[PDB]
Structure formats: structure tokens, C-alpha cells
Design an enzyme around this catalytic site. Structure first.
Site, short mmCIF file in Angstrom:
data_model
loop_
_atom_site.label_atom_id
_atom_site.label_comp_id
_atom_site.label_asym_id
_atom_site.label_seq_id
_atom_site.Cartn_x
_atom_site.Cartn_y
_atom_site.Cartn_z
N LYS A 100 -27.58 -16.02 66.21
CA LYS A 100 -27.89 -16.86 65.06
C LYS A 100 -29.40 -16.98 64.88
O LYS A 100 -30.12 -17.34 65.81
CB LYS A 100 -27.28 -18.25 65.26
CG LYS A 100 -27.51 -19.23 64.13
CD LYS A 100 -26.81 -20.54 64.44
CE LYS A 100 -26.91 -21.53 63.29
NZ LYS A 100 -26.28 -22.83 63.66
N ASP A 110 -27.38 -13.04 62.56
CA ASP A 110 -26.74 -13.75 61.46
C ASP A 110 -27.64 -14.88 60.97
O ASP A 110 -27.89 -15.85 61.69
CB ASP A 110 -25.39 -14.33 61.90
CG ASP A 110 -24.51 -14.70 60.72
OD1 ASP A 110 -25.07 -14.97 59.64
OD2 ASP A 110 -23.27 -14.72 60.88
N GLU A 126 -26.69 -10.06 59.17
CA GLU A 126 -25.60 -10.65 58.40
C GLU A 126 -26.10 -11.75 57.47
O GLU A 126 -26.79 -12.67 57.90
CB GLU A 126 -24.55 -11.21 59.36
CG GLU A 126 -23.15 -11.42 58.76
CD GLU A 126 -22.08 -11.67 59.82
OE1 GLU A 126 -21.76 -10.74 60.59
OE2 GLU A 126 -21.57 -12.80 59.89
N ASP A 137 -21.16 -11.67 54.33
CA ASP A 137 -20.16 -12.49 55.00
C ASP A 137 -19.80 -13.62 54.04
O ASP A 137 -18.76 -13.57 53.40
CB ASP A 137 -20.73 -13.04 56.32
CG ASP A 137 -19.72 -13.88 57.09
OD1 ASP A 137 -18.55 -13.96 56.67
OD2 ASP A 137 -20.11 -14.47 58.13
N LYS A 193 -12.65 -11.34 56.31
CA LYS A 193 -11.87 -12.39 56.96
C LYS A 193 -10.49 -12.19 56.36
O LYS A 193 -10.16 -12.75 55.32
CB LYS A 193 -12.41 -13.78 56.59
CG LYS A 193 -13.65 -14.20 57.39
CD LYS A 193 -14.90 -13.43 56.98
CE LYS A 193 -15.28 -13.71 55.53
NZ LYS A 193 -16.52 -12.97 55.13
MG LIG Z 1 -21.67 -14.67 59.43
#
Ligand SMILES: [Mg+2]
Length: 320
Positions: free
Chosen positions: A136, A165, A194, A219, A243
Site C-alpha cells: 500500500k 496499490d 494499482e 481496480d 472481482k
Molecule cells: Mg486495489
């Protein structure tokens, strides 16, 4: 065939915090289908708050509006605006008389906490066979995170793959500087960045992806089949984080793949769904056969061990 549905409200193993709030539980719907001979099928409808326009309440309304029996034509009436519901009913129908499913342990991506913590959290996962990580970023200053990244890339073992991300937290200028840094100091270990920018800045997202060397993955920008389709038609050259539980009818992804969607550009990830949805997804993976580590290393928040017996499904259902 006959069917039933039950709501579930499950506390997370531990709180999950995002820039849109804090959540301590996940809710959804479980579907149980049964034919005239007693064969059973199960499905899960679990839209994720904030992701897309589908709400659990709208899914519940749909369930209360549907007939007491199910047929392909009846399920075709499910609004395209309720992709999680399409997934739940589609997977439930396909599972009738087919449980338990044959599945396999695909490589899973391990998560690394923001900050310097990343330097001490990859070892245990690596020693357990995980070779892809997602760290992250956009939490500390770009300079601080870049210093940590330099150390991380040097520390990771040969063969490691790393995803960054940003959760759409960077502004345009910051994202641009980051990609310049990555273009230079980036190691062949960086799989992609991401969601560098928030979904509303789609023109900047596309422009960056078409000009920087480091790959970019969508995403937050891609929840439903409709959004994936839109990005495919825009000529997105990067990755798509799918997803499946929130996407819509699984057949819609297969259709996109038969058309302009590149299989190699897909990464299948978790929407913090339950064991019923996750097992259905792994069943689907027997066909799609992923080529990138799955974004399913979410056990800290919601553990959902794959279901290996029909009785396992029955137990989960009866426990409600
Ligand atoms: Mg993500």
C-alpha cells in the site's frame, strides 16, 4: 427448481479501514436451490459498499420479487444493474448437483502494510510459498515511500513480484512523478501500480497507461462487466483487477475474453466475500486458469476456506 435465500451479517476477523470509512462486518445473501430429486446448489450475492451502484437492499428486493421457481428465462430478467445478484444466481444454478467442486491452490498475492512495515512482513509469506506481494502506497510522502521501496526491492529474493496499490490516492502530479521514479529505479520486480488515480480521472489514467513504462492496473475503476467493457473500448493497455463476485454473470467475462479482453491482463481478486462465493470463483478458475497471483490474501479481515464437501455447505446454511 425451488429455492430459498437467507441474509448473513458476519463480523470481520478484524477491522478494515479505508479512505471511505471503517467497516467491522460484511453482509450478503446466500442462495440455496433444490431440484425434484433433492440435488442442491448454492450461491452468494455480496455487493461491496461503495463499489459500484448495487446495494444489498436492492438485491434483497430482487429476491423478494422473483418467482418461487427458477428457470434460465426467469434469471435473465435480473437487472444488469445488479451484477452481484447475477453472479449469485448464475453460480448457484450451475452448482446444482455438481457440489463439491474440483479446485486447486492457485498462487496468492501477499499483502504488505503501508510504511516501513513492508520490510518486515514479506519474509513469513515468502517462506510459505507466496512470491507476489502488494504494498500500500500513497500513505506517507512519495520520498519516504520511494526510499522504503528501494530497500524493499533490494531485500526481496530473486523471483519476487511486487504490486503497488495507491488506492486512487495520488493526484495527477504525484502520480506522474512516481511513474518517472519507477521508470528509472523500478526493478523488473514491479508487476504494476494499482489504481494510481481516483476513478473520476479516467482521461489521466488512460494517458498515463499509454505513456509510462511501468504497467498500471484498474481496480476501483472496474467493478462491473459494463465498466470493464468501457475500458476495453477505450483501449486500456494495462491490467484489470476482476472481482468476480461483484462483476455480474461469469459468462460475461468469458464473452469479453472471446472479444477484446486479454487473458494475460487479468488479475482475479477478492471482494471480502464468503466461502460460497470464493469456492464458486475457484471453480470458475478451473476454466479461466489465471496467470497472475490472486488478490485473495485477505484472511486477516475475512477468512473463507474453500468448501470441499456438500455437507460443508449445508452446515453453513443451517447455521444461519
Ligand atoms: Mg486495489
Amino acid at each position: 427448481l425451488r429455492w430459498q435465500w437467507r441474509i448473513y451479517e458476519e463480523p470481520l476477523q478484524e477491522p478494515l479501514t479505508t479512505a471511505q470509512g471503517v467497516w467491522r462486518s460484511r453482509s450478503g445473501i446466500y442462495l440455496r436451490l433444490e431440484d425434484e430429486q433433492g440435488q442442491v446448489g448454492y450461491g452468494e450475492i455480496a455487493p461491496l459498499p461503495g463499489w459500484g451502484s448495487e446495494t444489498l437492499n436492492a438485491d434483497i428486493a430482487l429476491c423478494q420479487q422473483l418467482p418461487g421457481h427458477l428457470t434460465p428465462e426467469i434469471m435473465a430478467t435480473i437487472p444488469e444493474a445488479l451484477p452481484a445478484a447475477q453472479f449469485g444466481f448464475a453460480t448457484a444454478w450451475q452448482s446444482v448437483g455438481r457440489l463439491p467442486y474440483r479446485v486447486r491452490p492457485w498462487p496468492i498475492c501477499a499483502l504488505l502494510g503501508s510504511g516501513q512495515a513492508a520490510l518486515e512482513q514479506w519474509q513469513q509469506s515468502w517462506q510459505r510459498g507466496q512470491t507476489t506481494f502488494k504494498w500500500k502506497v500513497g500513505v506517507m510522502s512519495p520520498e519516504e515511500e520511494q526510499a522504503i521501496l528501494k530497500a524493499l526491492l533490494a531485500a526481496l529474493p530473486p523471483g519476487a513480484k511486487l504490486r503497488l496499490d495507491a488506492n486512487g490516492s495520488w493526484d495527477r502530479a504525484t502520480a506522474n512523478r512516481w511513474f518517472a521514479w519507477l521508470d528509472r529505479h523500478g526493478n523488473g520486480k514491479i508487476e504494476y501500480v494499482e489504481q494510481p488515480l481516483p476513478p473520476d480521472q479516467w482521461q489521466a489514467l488512460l494517458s498515463l497507461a499509454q505513456t509510462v513504462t511501468t504497467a498500471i492496473a484498474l481496480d476501483e475503476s472496474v467493478v462491473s462487466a459494463a465498466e470493464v467493457q468501457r475500458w476495453v473500448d477505450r483501449g486500456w493497455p494495462g491490467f484489470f483487477v476482476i472481482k468476480t463476485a461483484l462483476f455480474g454473470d461469469p459468462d460475461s467475462l468469458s464473452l469479453l475474453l472471446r472479444r477484446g479482453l486479454e487473458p494475460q491482463r487479468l488479475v482475479f481478486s477478492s471482494a471480502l466475500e464468503g466461502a460460497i462465493a470464493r469456492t464458486a470463483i475457484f471453480h470458475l478458475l478451473e476454466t479461466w486458469q489465471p496467470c497472475h497471483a490472486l488478490g485473495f490474501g485477505v484472511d486477516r479481515w475475512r477468512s473463507a476456506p474453500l468448501l470441499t464437501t456438500l455437507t460443508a455447505y449445508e452446515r453453513l446454511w443451517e447455521r444461519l
